[model samples]
Target: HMSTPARRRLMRDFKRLQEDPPAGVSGAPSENNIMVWNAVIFGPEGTPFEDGTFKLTIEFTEEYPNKPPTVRFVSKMFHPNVYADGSICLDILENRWSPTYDVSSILTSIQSLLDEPNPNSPANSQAAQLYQENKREYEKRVSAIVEQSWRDC
Candidate 1:
């Protein structure tokens, strides 16, 4: 396989990820393809998702640094910003992204998003409604998913 500038950028990103790892996140390229990555984000303490291990996949293209990667959850999740199919609606993953946002930054953004979901532009309306109108029920739902995340691993 030939190396390209995009791949080199990814390599540097990976190196930086290992050098100064972000709290509660880890990732690496897939065994057979440098463009596909597997990642995990541990839920932050004091959140309903605490103690949860969330899996994700990042799909990159040769246009990287100019374009953003596709990040999706592999482990099931229930959140206002997360789609039923595991896709997320985050500004940094969309219009707000810049070339400076690497794997570490992306994952950390998502980790914080876990507890700070925006229900206004919801992908999952049910979760959004619960998140907005019923705090106790929303935490119960999130806690159930967190318990399920343990068995999913």
Candidate 2:
């Protein structure tokens, strides 16, 4: 089973992550499934989400490297780029994806997104509105989400 290109690539990804993991992010394949992974991103310090621990899952197919995996948050979030159902609205995860992207890069991107969201292209209208119209309120809301993450953990 590990002979497939996708599986082999994932093994490399696992090793690469251990050797040089991105700051504030970590992930690995699920217990008995190499094609699925569970990940966590520690919210960036000096930001509203600081100290928050966000969980996510990534599901890959054998067609990987040629296509992107499906990544979704397992934790609730309050961000313009995240939908009500935890679907993230990030270009690299969609049409902008490239074969060069790896699991570590994906998680790093998400970690960055938590601090610098793109409100112009929003997945959550209210969050976008607050981010654009009232940043203080936006930060307050993010603080609540950050607090909730602790309980959820």
Candidate 3:
């Protein structure tokens, strides 16, 4: 169980986010649960994912801060770390999590991830294969999705 101070800290962070949210991202308060949040990420600039909007579900467990929240994409993404089911394979969200890390930092890390993907341990095998085997094809697919995302968004 989290100590009272930890819970207070979490609430403070949540309140701050609600007041001054990050750019290209917006989250809604969790329905039926305040600890869970649903966010949408508008892809960062200078990357293939630019102009793309990706949805994510962030669930903060009772042990949050001590343990990182589980962040998974709710939208279709062609990244190596993002699985078909939307689960992400990022270290900070997993084994490398630290108590000092904030939601803004985590979201920034994810944005950076869009700029540089790690093909070494991919969640989507086909995407990873495409990324490794043929760079052109990978770009083509990514661009296609960007176009589609524009149309949809």
Candidate 4:
């Protein structure tokens, strides 16, 4: 369990998010599960994913500030850094985490990842190859999945 100071910090951070939610994210409804949250990302402008709402799942563990949480997309998204199961390939979630980071900072990183994908270490090989070989086809597939996400909603 977190010490009182750590718990208070967590609560304060959560409350701040509730009071002034970020763009592209509505508050999650899991009142009983403070460690797990859901969010939607409105695709960045001028990108292939523009106008799409991408669903993401954030799961923080007990070690929290000491260890980065696990984040994955719940939506049917087709992207180089996103796995078929919706797991993301961001480095901070793995080898590059720092204790100084916060939930809002992590969310911002994810949003940036959607705009600038790193194909060097992709979660979806096919998407990576398509992105490299045929940019237009990759865009089409991503757009299709984005549209599919809306239909599922």
| Per-model tally of clashing residue pairs | 0, 0, 0, 0
Task: Evaluate residue 143 in candidate 3 and report its C-alpha lDDT on the 0 to 100 scale.
Answer: 79
> What TM-score goes with each of the models?
0.95, 0.94, 0.84, 0.86
TM-score between candidate 1 and the true structure: 0.95
For candidate 4, the 10 contiguous residues with the lowest summed lDDT are 1-10
| Candidate 1 residue-wise lDDT, 22-108, digit = tens | 988999999999999999999999999999999999999999878999999999899999999999998888889999999899999
User: Total backbone clashes of model 2?
Assistant: 0
- Against the true structure, whose TM-score is highest? 1
Considering TM-score, which of the candidate structures 1 and 3 is the better prediction for this target?
1
Predicted candidate 4 versus true structure: per-residue lDDT over 1-153, tens digit per residue: 245544455566577667876766543525767677777777777888887888787887767778787888888988889888888888888888988776666777787887889867778888889988999999999899878778655
> Evaluated with lDDT, which candidate comes out highest?
1
Ranking by lDDT: 1, 2, 4, 3
Error of 2 at 100 (Å): 0.9
> After superposition, which runs of candidate 2 have C-alpha atoms over 4 Å from their true positions?
none
User: RMSD in angstroms, candidate 2?
Assistant: 1.3
| Pairs of colliding residues, candidate 3 | none
Error of 1 at 123 (Å): 0.5
Model 1, backbone clash pairs (residues 3+ apart or across chains), number: 0
Which regions in candidate 1 have their CA more than 4 angstroms from the true location? none
Predicted candidate 2 versus true structure: per-residue lDDT over 1-153, tens digit per residue:
378999999999999998889888899999999999999888999998898888899999998877889889888899999999988988788878988999998998888888899755799999999988999999999989888877765
Per-candidate local distance difference test: 0.90, 0.89, 0.76, 0.77
